[PDB]
Amino acid sequence: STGSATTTPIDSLDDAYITPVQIGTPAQTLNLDFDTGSSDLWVFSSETTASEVDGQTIYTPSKSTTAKLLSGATWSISYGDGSSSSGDVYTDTVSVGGLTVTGQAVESAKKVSSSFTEDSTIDGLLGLAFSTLNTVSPTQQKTFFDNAKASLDSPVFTADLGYHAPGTYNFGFIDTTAYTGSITYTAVSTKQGFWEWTSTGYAVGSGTFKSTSIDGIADTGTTLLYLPATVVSAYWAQVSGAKSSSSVGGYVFPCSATLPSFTFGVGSARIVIPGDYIDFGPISTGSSSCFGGIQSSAGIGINIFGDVALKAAFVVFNGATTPTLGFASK
Numbered sequence: 001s002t003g004s005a006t007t008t009p010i011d012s013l014d015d016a017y018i019t020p021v022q023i024g025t026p027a028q029t030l031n032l033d034f035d036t037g038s039s040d041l042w043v044f045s046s047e048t049t050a051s052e053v054d055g056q057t058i059y060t061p062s063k064s065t066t067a068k069l070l071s072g073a074t075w076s077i078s079y080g081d082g083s084s085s086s087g088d089v090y091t092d093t094v095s096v097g098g099l100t101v102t103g104q105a106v107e108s109a110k111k112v113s114s115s116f117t118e119d120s121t122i123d124g125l126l127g128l129a130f131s132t133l134n135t136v137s138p139t140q141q142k143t144f145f146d147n148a149k150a151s152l153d154s155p156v157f158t159a160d161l162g163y164h165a166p167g168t169y170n171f172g173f174i175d176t177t178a179y180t181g182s183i184t185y186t187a188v189s190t191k192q193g194f195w196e197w198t199s200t201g202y203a204v205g206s207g208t209f210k211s212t213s214i215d216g217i218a219d220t221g222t223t224l225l226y227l228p229a230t231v232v233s234a235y236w237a238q239v240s241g242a243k244s245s246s247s248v249g250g251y252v253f254p255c256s257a258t259l260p261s262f263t264f265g266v267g268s269a270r271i272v273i274p275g276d277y278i279d280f281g282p283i284s285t286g287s288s289s290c291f292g293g294i295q296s297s298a299g300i301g302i303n304i305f306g307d308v309a310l311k312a313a314f315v316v317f318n319g320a321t322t323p324t325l326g327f328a329s330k
């Protein structure tokens with residue numbers, strides 16, 4: 001089996017990407033944030049506290065003839081950005097881009113935090129990290145990819161995120177027309193439940209490549225690129241007027257700037273993030289100070305290759321017995 005679905009930015013800044021997912025019988029289509037940094041498939045639902053729903057599409061299990069309540073099971077997650085959600089659990093049929101899993105755990109939100117309520121574009125999350133991070137208790141559940149893997153032509157999925165444009169998630173096959181050159185594969189540690197790998201270094205603009213090991217995670221659910229303070233300082237030092245703002249919470253720069261590219265290493269290969277990908281626009285409406293797309297990881301304890309980095313590449317999440325990651329230019 002295979003599946004293929006289009007993923008679309010939620011807004012003009014690429015703050016996140018949504019992908020349509022069919023749940024239940026008859027199908028209920030929700031637009032989910034595919035998140036390689038977490039392992040729960042959770043949705044706004046008919047059970048979500050009414051005051052916490054504001055424009056999202058909801059899953060109604062009582063209208064699905066294949067939904068079954070998972071007795072006594074609950075879930076609760078808190079994310080790196082401070083947001084959270086929790087609820088009960090059903091099993092149901094879930095399809096992505098033509099690929100179907102029966103008996104998938106669908107985590108129905110009873111409560112969501114304000115940031116989720118305030119974002120009408122995201123109907124839930126579809127976690128694609130390793131199932132060891134799944135939060136369902138007392139019986140932990142498996143991700144959509146884990147459940148699908150044995151049925152797939154190849155035990156892989158690929159992320160091809162667009163820059164201010166749609167892109168694609170594929171399951172079970174590698175579209176060799178979607179990238180240029182070759183795919184460079186690199187080792188993954190699953191010990192923390194993430195797609196955790198080690199970049200071989202970086203360059204700023206046309207500058208000299210610095211060979212240095214940078215351990216981090218490939219996380220489609222994080223918007224920005226979070227790297228060590230030394231690396232981030234070296235990047236923003238090339239932008240006149242850029243500075244780290246405590247009040248804003250990161251590096252900001254004059255909106256009139258044209259930003260340098262940022263290169264990261266994958267083995268001997270190099271992925272180049274164009275400068276414009278690092279511009280996240282005015283810090284507040286009408287401001288001429290703009291928010292940077294490369295920020296320090298110092299206060300979060302892990303480096304994160306989020307969408308800013310991943311959307312510059314075609315990325316293979318290889319879920320074979322020994323997982324690996326692949327990156328190609330595109």
Ligand SMILES: N=C1N=C(N)c2ccccc21
Pocket residue numbers: 033035037038079080081083125219220221222
């Ligand atoms: N800060 C986040 N990191 C994620 N991987 C994620 C997923 C969904 C909401 C917020 C976040």
Ligand SMILES: N=C1N=C(N)c2ccccc21
Pocket residue numbers: none
């Ligand atoms: N989307 C934009 N709106 C602007 N006024 C602008 C200036 C420079 C780059 C991108 C943009």
Ligand SMILES: N=C1N=C(N)c2ccccc21
Pocket residue numbers: 254255256257279280281282290
């Ligand atoms: N006013 C802008 N200046 C920019 N550099 C930019 C980027 C994206 C959206 C809006 C703007």
Ligand SMILES: N=C1N=C(N)c2ccccc21
Pocket residue numbers: 013248249280281282283284291
């Ligand atoms: N955390 C942020 N602070 C901002 N002013 C901003 C703009 C665009 C994306 C993310 C952020």
